[PDB]
From a paper:
Septins are present in all mammalian and fungal cellular systems and participate in so diverse intracellular processes such as cytokinesis, polarity establishment or cellular adhesion. They are cytoskeletal guanine nucleotide-binding proteins that belong to the superclass of P-loop NTPases.
G-interfaces are formed between [name] and [name] as well as between [name] and [name]. [name] and [name] are connected by a NC-interface. All subunits contain GDP without a coordinated Mg2+ ion. However, a filament-like structure with the subunit arrangement [name]-[name]-[name]-[name]:[name]-[name]-[name]-[name] can be generated, indicating that the crystallization conditions favored the formation of a non-native [name]-[name] interface. [name] lacks the α0-helix in our expression construct, explaining the tetrameric nature of the complex. The switch 1 loop of [name] is longer than in the other canonical septins and is – except Shs1H51 and Shs1K52 - not in contact with the nucleotide. Instead, it snuggles along the surface of the [name] subunit where it folds into an interrupted β-strand between V68 and N80 which is attached to the β2-strand of the central β-sheet.
Numbering used by the authors:
A (entry chain D): 22 to 81, 92 to 113, 126 to 249, 255 to 339
B (entry chain C): 12 to 61, 63 to 64, 67 to 214, 225 to 313
C (entry chain A): 31 to 244, 249 to 306
D (entry chain B): 98 to 151, 177 to 409
């Protein structure tokens, strides 16, 4: 299958580390410590680099130019993680939250999603159509919530709404180690209250008794709080290390990351794909045809 | 052969200083969720501030709120003026968000100047900010354009003390790298940050502590209003996570005690004197050009 | 006989007490008092003359203690010696009026200034404007015997140096201080005059109150005897102005100063 | 715990010792009253007046001398003003003693001018922080000129009246002269500096302050030279053919009380009053 996932959030959330952990391959480099390798060959047997990292959109360490605003930059890195063979193109946003005005960033991301929708529509409405054409539509999208502990900001809400317009959007609390149990609970409650207040159309984990129970539990879990590291233990366990203690990404209580990974690449992958392909895209196409 | 009381003049000065009382003014700049309220509640051992102001319109207007209190420790009274920056950096468009804060500092300086313009001037209401703590989110990446320009704008109005918020969030190597990047940026951008006075000293250890303090910038701040046992029978103020406990009073875990030395314990008088002899003087000169 | 002794100084110098002690009775009470309102009403130095009778030596003497209240006691003492000079010369004019009068009397009372005691403050500095002018105009108008008030204010060496300084000041201003050496005097007389002259300006300490130990002032760290020779010159001045030169003083006030004023006044009358 | 914001006064103590101190003192009196001996004994420096700083006379002469006196590390920059000619004139009118007042006003003027400059660069305080008037030990009453000058100066400078050469006057004489002088001062409305009593301070130190106020006018003596006591103990003072007076002995003089009120105890408070009350009144007048 051809799966497409977007990772959007303010700079300093942990999207690069999250992607490296998910792939089990350090295919994405962290900013300012990069250029040693960016789209290198995978260190994972299942991970393949079918296309290096490349920019799909642009709108704009050097200490003298640190003041300069980066703008927004959207990059799609294509990989093949394996019938089971999945062609997974990961889109990522950089420079979001690193400028004064972030309206440009929201505009660019929404425009990229809309242009992919339009490309698919044009292929569909073609006298000679390529039946196996590669769709660039973002089947799922994860928005990283900066660990404020208070609630959702303005840029957070607007970006999540923009992403929701064209793809499913999932609220993901990042760096949950920054929060204690009570603090993380309160932060999650605040996030849910704010999305309800502003009516952000965040994705809902809402035919089988067990399936209904799992959906209910996953909905109660959201926003998903996760700890991610691209560094591993000598034994080979992705872990964070602090002077007061060492965190393991595998630990269930520390991170909901493995539930999130299961839903993203396992259970609900097809659900995200079908909803983005046959509900959002179809409604957009109907509106265009009415235009 | 009797002595003169030249050696007692300093003890007289001490007597008047301790019987008069002091006033400290600190502006805590940053975004929402940088452990600022908890920091000021931890530095003074008391709850000077609150629970967040929240559930209001998402587009926050950068305002200035001053929380004033009278604190007594050893029969010495201090008027603490904790100035805040609600809504700063919490919006999609944060352009010209540094204007209100620098404007407030300039307004306080002008107020003091106009108190001097009084014909028969009396006791002085001095709200000039003796310290400015700019909190940086622990992104572990670098300083944002908003951050650098606000800091540079307010670095001439008063004293600037960069601090890395929620420094426990970052791992040791990550926080050290973040500190190095911040120092390089503020060195290239030429931002001016308060440095403890080590000169170039009779108390070689005091200027040595000055050196230790200036080699620990931007300061790592870990603040908690709850205390936990360390396992040896001693309760230390700390942040309790299941993997480990981040004690605020251990120099190995945070630079909070260094910041307390700079702000209240060791270099508080120096901060006040620099704010009143260097910054205010330049503002007054330019205002009276 | 009638003797006229005048005291010239400021309030405090200790002149009233000095007279009181030199005569052994309370003759003159401080004319200045302890009130700034007791000072003269003319805002110029005034004269207080008091006549007492002292016959304890069986030499009955009619003392006339004269005092100059107001001297150096106001802010403007620009003419604080003019009234003193006027008093002296008027007392002289009375005697010459009686002697120039037809069918005069046998005893034409001598109210002239037989002796003057100018009290020099124990400051250790040269003569001030007031002191200089007053001594300049009073040395040739009457017999002046310098004295140093509150000589307790100067240690022995300090007192000696100040006395030498005052002696040199007298010589510089050409001031004529009593006694006066003459040719009639014998050798013993000349040497006595030299000695009392070396004592001048005197350093006298006066106390009308008596102290008990084992006449003087007794304090916390000190105890002076007004009649001690190795402590003060009070005995010397006493003997000098009461016995040694008293006769010479009263004779020179009638032979030198009075006859001088007589010649001057009569010459002026002749001319006019 | 203990947040260390009560440590600020200690930082002030250290700053003070580091930056030394400065005291401008005025001495008005007759020539020969003992204002050159008292100063040297107060500052234990025989050369306290050897750094002279930068058709008949009819006005007193104001002489400025600047020295430095350091004890146990702390250093003080003393600037003593001496009047020369007070009383020596036979006029002694307001013009005679005007130069002293003009000099005090000039110090205040320089301070005000530098405070009101655009550059407002570091200014050195020359304002007269105290005025010692030496009162002769006549034993009768405060003299007219003394009253006039002390009233003319009681607002410009802190007033510290003393009775000079007090060793001559007997104990009872000193008491009576002190009482008369104080009565004359109060009825001329001449006001003297009252030592402050700090709060949360020792009650003994408060009693010392009260005694310092109620011992005025003082009775001070000066002799930096050493004389032998009747006990065989060398002591600072003066030796006469009748006895020996000791400058450091409290039983003999209020010298130690004056040193307390002028240097040891309330020098800083005197400077504070001069720079916070008197100078601001001068500024209001200039305004
Ligand atoms: N405390 C904490 N730090 C994290 C976590 N994940 C990543 N980081 C660190 O935070 C930074 C994340 O930067 P990066 O993932 O490149 O962020 P992006 O630019 O927003 O995509 C790096 O310094 C990571 O080492 C996490 O779960 N917790
Ligand atoms: N990682 C970390 N989180 C902290 C720390 N102190 C407080 N917090 C979290 O941040 C919250 C307090 O933020 P607050 O001080 O109100 O925010 P600000 O004043 O707007 O920066 C707490 O409820 C915690 O969840 C700290 O030292 N480290
Ligand atoms: N120390 C000292 N005091 C003296 C001396 N003579 C007088 N006094 C004091 O001077 C004070 C005033 O003297 P007094 O003769 O009454 O006054 P005057 O006539 O106005 O100068 C008295 O209280 C005496 O105690 C002296 O030789 N030494
Ligand atoms: N009796 C007495 N004489 C003193 C005292 N202090 C100083 N003197 C003498 O007073 C004289 C004048 O003092 P000085 O300091 O030279 O005077 P200034 O011209 O006022 O500076 C000196 O020769 C000292 O011997 C004192 O307490 N008592």
């Amino acid at each position: 299958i051809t799966y497409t996932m977007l990772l959007c959030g303010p700079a300093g959330t942990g999207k690069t580390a999250f992607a490296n952990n998910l792939l089990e391959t350090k295919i994405f480099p962290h900013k300012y410590q990069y250029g040693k390798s960016n789209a290198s060959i995978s260190s994972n047997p299942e991970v393949k680099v079918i296309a290096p990292t490349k920019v799909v959109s642009f709108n704009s360490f050097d200490p003298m130019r640190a003041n300069l605003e980066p703008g927004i930059t959207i990059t799609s890195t294509s990989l093949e993680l394996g019938d089971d063979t999945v062609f997974f193109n990961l889109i990522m946003t950089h420079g979001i939250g690193e400028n004064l005005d972030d309206s440009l960033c929201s505009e660019e991301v929404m425009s990229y999603l809309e242009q992919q929708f339009d490309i698919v529509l044009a292929e569909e409405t073609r006298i000679k159509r390529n039946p196996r054409f590669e769709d660039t539509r973002v089947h799922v999208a994860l928005y990283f919530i900066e660990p404020t502990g208070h609630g959702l900001r303005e840029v957070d809400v607007e970006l999540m709404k923009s992403i929701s317009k064209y793809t499913n959007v999932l609220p993901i609390i990042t760096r949950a180690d920054s929060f204690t149990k009570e603090e993380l609970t309160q932060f999650r409650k605040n996030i849910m209250f704010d999305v309800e207040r502003y009516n952000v159309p965040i994705y809902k984990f809402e035919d089988d008794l067990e399936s209904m129970e799992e959906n209910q539990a996953l909905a109660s879990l959201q926003p998903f709080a996760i700890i991610t590291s691209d560094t591993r233990d000598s034994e080979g366990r992705y872990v964070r290390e602090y002077p007061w203690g060492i965190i393991s990404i595998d630990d269930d209580k520390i991170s909901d990351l493995k539930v999130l990974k299961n839903v993203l690449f396992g259970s609900h992958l097809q659900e995200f794909k079908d909803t983005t392909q046959n509900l959002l895209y179809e409604n957009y196409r109907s509106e265009k045809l009415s235009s | 052969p009797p002595p003169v009381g030249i050696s007692n003049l300093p003890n007289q000065r001490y007597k008047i200083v301790n019987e008069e009382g002091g006033t400290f003014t600190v502006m805590l700049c940053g975004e929402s969720g940088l452990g600022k309220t908890t920091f000021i509640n931890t530095l003074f051992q008391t709850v000077l501030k609150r629970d967040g102001h929240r559930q209001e319109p998402i587009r926050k207007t950068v305002e200035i709120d001053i929380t004033r209190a009278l604190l007594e420790e050893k029969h010495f009274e201090l008027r603490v003026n904790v100035i805040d920056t609600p809504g700063f950096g919490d919006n999609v468009n944060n352009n010209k968000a540094w204007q209100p804060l620098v404007d407030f500092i300039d307004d306080q300086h002008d107020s003091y100047m106009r108190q001097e313009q009084q014909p028969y001037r009396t006791k002085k209401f001095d709200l000039r900010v003796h310290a400015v703590l700019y909190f940086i989110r622990p992104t572990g990446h670098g300083l944002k354009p908003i951050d650098i320009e606000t800091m540079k704008r307010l670095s001439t109005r008063a004293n600037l003390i960069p601090v890395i918020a929620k420094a426990d969030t970052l791992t040791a190597q990550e926080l050290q790298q973040f500190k190095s990047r911040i120092r390089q940026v503020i060195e290239a951008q030429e931002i001016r940050i308060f440095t403890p006075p080590l000169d170039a000293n009779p108390d070689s250890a005091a200027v040595e502590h000055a050196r230790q303090l200036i080699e620990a910038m931007p300061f790592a701040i870990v603040g908690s209003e709850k205390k936990f046992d360390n396992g040896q029978g001693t309760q230390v103020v700390a942040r309790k996570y299941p993997w480990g406990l981040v004690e605020i009073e251990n120099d190995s875990h945070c630079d909070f005690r260094k910041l307390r030395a700079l702000l209240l314990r060791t270099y508080l008088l120096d901060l006040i004197s620099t704010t009143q002899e260097m910054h205010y003087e330049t503002y007054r000169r330019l205002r009276l050009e | 006989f009638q003797f006229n002794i005048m005291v010239v100084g400021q309030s405090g110098l200790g002149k009233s007490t000095l007279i009181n002690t030199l005569f052994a009775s309370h003759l003159i009470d401080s004319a200045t008092g302890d009130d700034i309102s007791a000072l003269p009403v003319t805002k110029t130095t005034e004269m207080k003359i008091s006549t007492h009778t002292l016959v304890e030596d069986r030499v009955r003497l009619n003392i006339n203690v004269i005092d100059t209240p107001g001297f150096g006691d106001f802010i403007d003492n620009s003419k604080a010696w003019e009234p003193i000079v006027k008093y002296i010369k008027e007392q002289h004019s009375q005697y010459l009026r009686k002697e120039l009068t037809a069918q005069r009397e046998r005893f034409i009372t001598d109210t002239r200034v037989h002796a003057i005691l100018y009290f020099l403050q124990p400051n250790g500095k040269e003569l001030s404007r007031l002191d200089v002018e007053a001594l300049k105009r009073l040395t040739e108008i009457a017999n002046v015997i310098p004295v140093i008030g509150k000589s307790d204010t100067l240690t022995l060496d300090e007192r000696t140096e100040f006395r030498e300084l005052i002696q040199n000041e007298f010589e510089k201003y050409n001031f004529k201080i009593y006694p006066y050496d003459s040719e009639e005097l014998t050798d013993e007389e000349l040497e006595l005059n030299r000695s009392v002259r070396s004592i001048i300006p005197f350093a006298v300490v006066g106390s009308e109150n008596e102290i008990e130990i084992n006449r003087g002032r007794k304090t916390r760290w000190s105890a002076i005897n007004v009649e001690d020779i190795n402590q003060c010159d009070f005995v010397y001045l006493r003997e000098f102005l009461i016995r040694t030169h008293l006769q010479d003083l009263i004779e020179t006030t009638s032979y030198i100063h009075y006859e001088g004023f007589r010649a001057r006044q009569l010459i002026a009358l002749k001319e006019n | 715990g203990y947040v260390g914001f009560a440590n600020l006064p200690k930082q002030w103590h250290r700053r003070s010792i580091k930056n030394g101190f400065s005291f401008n003192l005025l001495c008005v009196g007759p020539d020969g009253i003992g204002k050159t001996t008292l100063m040297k004994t107060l500052f234990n420096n025989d050369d306290i007046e050897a750094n002279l700083v930068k058709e008949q006379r009819h006005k007193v002469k104001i002489k400025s001398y600047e020295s430095v006196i350091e004890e146990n590390g702390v250093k003080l920059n003393l600037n003593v003003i001496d009047t020369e000619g007070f009383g020596d004139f036979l006029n002694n009118d307001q013009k005679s003693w005007d130069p002293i007042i003009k000099e005090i006003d000039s110090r205040f003027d320089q301070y005000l001018d530098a405070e009101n400059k655009i550059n407002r660069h570091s200014i050195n305080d020359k304002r007269i922080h105290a005025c010692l008037y030496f009162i002769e030990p006549t034993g009768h009453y405060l003299k007219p000129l003394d009253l006039k000058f002390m009233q003319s100066v009681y607002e410009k400078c802190n007033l510290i009246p003393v009775i000079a050469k007090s060793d001559i006057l007997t104990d009872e004489e000193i008491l009576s002269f002190k009482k008369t002088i104080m009565n004359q001062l109060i009825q001329s409305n001449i006001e003297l500096f009252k030592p402050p009593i700090y709060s949360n301070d020792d009650a003994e130190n408060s009693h010392l302050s009260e005694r310092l106020f109620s011992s005025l006018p003082y009775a001070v003596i000066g002799s930096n030279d050493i004389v032998e006591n009747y006990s065989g103990n060398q002591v600072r003072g003066r030796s006469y053919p009748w006895g020996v007076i000791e400058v450091d002995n409290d039983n003999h003089s209020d010298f130690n009380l004056l040193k307390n009120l002028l240097i040891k105890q309330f020098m800083e408070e005197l400077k504070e009053r001069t720079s916070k009350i008197l100078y601001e009144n001068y500024r209001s007048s200039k305004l």
